[PDB]
Each structure stands twice: as C-alpha cells, then as structure tokens.
C-alpha cells in the first residue's frame, strides 16, 4: 500500500493463495478466462479476495474490466497514490 | 423377594406422582385448542385431575398437539418438544395432528405430528370433544400408571 | 448463638434439598440429548431507564437510612429540633422525587 512493487507482490500473493489457480502458469499478464481457464464467478471471488486483503470497495462496473493481475494492480494504483 | 417388592412400591409411588401431576403446555395450534380450552372450562375441568396449563415448556410434562401441524412450524414443534424435561409425553389431539386430517394431501401440512414427535396417546376427532380429550388424558394416566421403570432397572 | 444455630439449620435444610434435587433425579441416565428466545444471538442493548430507576432506588434508600432512627428520636428532649429535621428529611425525599418528576426521569417506567 506504500510502494507499487509491494502492491504487485501482494496481488500475486492473493492470487497464489487462491487454490483454484495453477501457480505455474500465473503471470502478471495472465488472463483469467482463456489463460487461467476460470469461470466468471471465480474472477468475482478473486475481486472479493482483493478486497479482503487490500481493504477498499470495488464497484461492479470497473471490476468486470479487470481480466489480468496487471489490470487489478492498475485499478488499485488508480484508487491509491503510489 | 424384598428388593423387588421395594422397587414395585417405589414404581407405584413415582408413577402415581407422575400420573396425578400432569402439567401440559398451553400450546394450541388450531380448532382443537378451542375444545382443549373447553376441557379447561368449568364443566370438564382438567384442574381437578391435577392437570394445569403452563406457559414455559420447561415446567411442563405432556405436550398436547392440539391442531394442524404445518411444514412451516414443524421445526418449531420439534424444538418446543426438545425443550421439555424427561419424562415428557405427547398427546395427539384431532385428525390433523393424528394423520394429517382434512388437509392430508396438502403441500404444506405434516401428515401427522408422529412424524415429528413420539406420540403416546392418539385422541381422534375433528375436534374430539372435551370429554373425549379428557378421556385421552385419563388413558394417558392409565398408561403412566402401568410403567415399570424401577422394576426393569432392578431386573436389567 | 441461637441465631447462628437457626441460620445454620435453615441453610443446611436449603442445601440438603438442593442436593436431593441435583443428585436424586441425576441418578437417572435418561438419554444423551443435545437441545440445539426473543433475541437470537445479538448483544443485549443497555437500557438507560432501568439503570436510572435503580439509582433512584439507591438514593431514596439512603434517604430511608437517614429516616430510620425516627422512632428512637421521638423520645428526645429536643423535640422541636427533631420535628424540624424529620420534616426536613421527608421534605428532601419529596423534593428529590419532584426533581425526578419534572425533569422527565419517571417516564416509560413512571
């Protein structure tokens, strides 16, 4: 929450705690639907795990457009300072 | 022998105390509760048999299922029955509590409260009269009169 | 001494009947049951008004504690002073009740 690299590593740590994802194919630009092969509800509970760890609410309209960890860390960085 | 005569007289004593101090809960459900009120009314008068209505089910001795049991209230009935200390008794009053009654084929009716609670006396009617409900209570008193608890405790 | 014997006997009879009530029907084994309320699980909210009527009881009980030696104080040789202070203490209990009245303290448990 202080530095951008810690926020990116914490995004990846929330994702690697999420046991459905294969951690081998996980990257920063990995796509949930076609690379990770995840359902939509899997992405929704990923967003709620991001709120469980990062502690700020995300509306539904700008959580549907977050299809990679890079978009998630860009949305976190846009709602914070870094 | 001596010990068997002792446990026989103690069985008669405790069964006398249990049959002559029945405390039912004031738990009505439907039309049968009106005739159960008439069995509390001055003519038939449960109170002269040692039979008083109590509001909390903790100080109650017999659960009179007087009325139709629905699906929405069957866990409430089972929880009320589970709040009773033992020995507790169940009297099923009327046709809907007995087997489902006039609403037997309904989507929302439990087809007899004996699917839920262990019924000891099945009092039949629609509603059974206050004289008939008091007959069922007297038959429950005869049933408690012939329980053999300490005889079986001695002979087990 | 006789008071202590009577207290001990009454306390002994109470504890004896409680022992009979918690161990003679607990000779039963009956059945291993589980047993799995208006408020369900939430915390009991504090009532300011029940606490205020308890404090009003405590303060009037202290005023009673001042009033209790009056049947002995009627025997005094300073009777004008005693009647003055007795009427003044009952008057102060009445003025405490009047201030509890007019400032809405006796409301919804009046």
């Amino acid at each position: 929450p202080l530095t951008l690299e810690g926020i990116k590593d914490r995004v990846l740590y929330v994702l690697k705690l999420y046991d459905k994802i294969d951690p081998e194919k996980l990257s920063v630009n990995s796509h949930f639907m076609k690379d990770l092969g995840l359902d939509s509800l899997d992405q929704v509970e990923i967003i709620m795990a991001m709120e469980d760890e990062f502690g700020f609410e995300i509306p539904d309209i700008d959580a549907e457009k977050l299809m990679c960890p890079q978009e998630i860390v860009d949305y976190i960085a846009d709602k914070k300072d870094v | 022998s001596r010990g068997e005569y002792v446990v026989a007289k103690l069985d008669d004593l405790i069964n006398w105390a249990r049959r002559s101090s029945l405390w039912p809960m004031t738990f009505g459900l439907a039309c049968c509760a009106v005739e159960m009120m008439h069995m509390a009314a001055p003519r038939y008068d449960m109170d002269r048999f040692g039979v008083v209505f109590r509001a909390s089910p903790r100080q109650s001795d017999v659960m009179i299922v007087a009325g139709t049991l629905t699906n929405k209230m069957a866990p409430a009935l089972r929880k009320v029955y589970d709040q009773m200390p033992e020995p507790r008794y169940v009297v099923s009053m009327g046709s809907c509590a007995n087997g489902g009654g006039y609403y037997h084929y309904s989507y929302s009716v439990v087809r007899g409260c004996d699917r839920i609670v262990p019924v000891d006396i099945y009092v039949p009617g629609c509603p059974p009269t206050a004289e008939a409900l008091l007959y069922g209570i007297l038959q429950l008193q005869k049933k408690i009169k012939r329980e053999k608890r300490l005889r079986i405790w001695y002979r087990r | 001494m006789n008071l202590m014997i009577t207290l001990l006997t009454n306390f002994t009879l109470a504890t004896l009947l409680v022992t009979i009530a918690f161990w003679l029907p607990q000779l039963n084994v009956y059945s291993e049951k589980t047993s799995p309320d208006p408020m369900g699980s939430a915390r009991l909210p504090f009532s300011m008004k029940f606490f205020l009527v308890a404090i009003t009881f405590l303060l009037f009980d202290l005023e009673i504690a001042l009033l209790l030696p009056l049947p002995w104080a009627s025997q005094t040789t300073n009777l004008n002073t005693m009647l003055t202070m007795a009427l003044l203490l009952i008057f102060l209990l009445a003025v405490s009740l009047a201030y509890e009245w007019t400032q809405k303290g006796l409301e919804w448990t009046e």
Partner: protein
C-alpha cells in the same frame, strides 16, 4: 493492640491493592473501592463501640450514605463509559494519552 483491627486494616489494604492493580474491568475497580468503604465501616464501628463513644454511632451511617452516593456517581460514570465503548474495559479509556 487489638487483633481484629489488623484483619480489618489488611482487608482495607487488600481491597486497596485490588483497586491499585487493574485487570480489565471498571466494575471491579468500583467493587474494590466499595470493599475499601466496607472495611472502613467495620473498623469505625468496632472503634466507636469499643470506646462506648455514643455520639459517633451516627458516623458510620454517614460514611455509608456519602460513599454509597459516591458509588452511585461512579456507576453512572461507568454506564456512560460503557455506552460510549460497548464495554467497561479500561483499555478503551486511553484517548487522553495525546
């Protein structure tokens, strides 16, 4: 001197050390304060009766009345604290550190 006075003073100092060492609760602090008052009541009564000093027989009633009003004041302060924080825990009462 008299042996029972040692016990009443030691009960006063035990209730003191209970008050002078908080654990968690503020009600326990009020109970230690009123245990101090209780020991003071007993000790005053034993002195005033052993002296046959008649006029001070009204003094323990005055001690009891004034310190019960003091206890009611403290209970009201506790009630306002527990209305603010939900509990009467003393670790909630540290906003005046800064």
């Amino acid at each position: 001197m008299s042996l029972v006075y040692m016990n009443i003073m030691m009960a006063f100092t035990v209730s003191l050390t209970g008050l002078l060492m908080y654990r968690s609760h503020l009600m326990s602090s009020l109970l230690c304060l009123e245990g101090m008052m209780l020991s003071l009541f007993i000790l005053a009564t034993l002195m005033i009766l052993n002296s046959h000093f008649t006029l001070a027989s009204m003094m323990p009633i005055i001690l009891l009345v004034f310190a019960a009003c003091e206890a009611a004041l403290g209970l009201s302060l506790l009630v306002m604290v527990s209305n603010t924080y939900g509990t009467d825990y003393v670790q909630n009462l540290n906003l005046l550190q800064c």
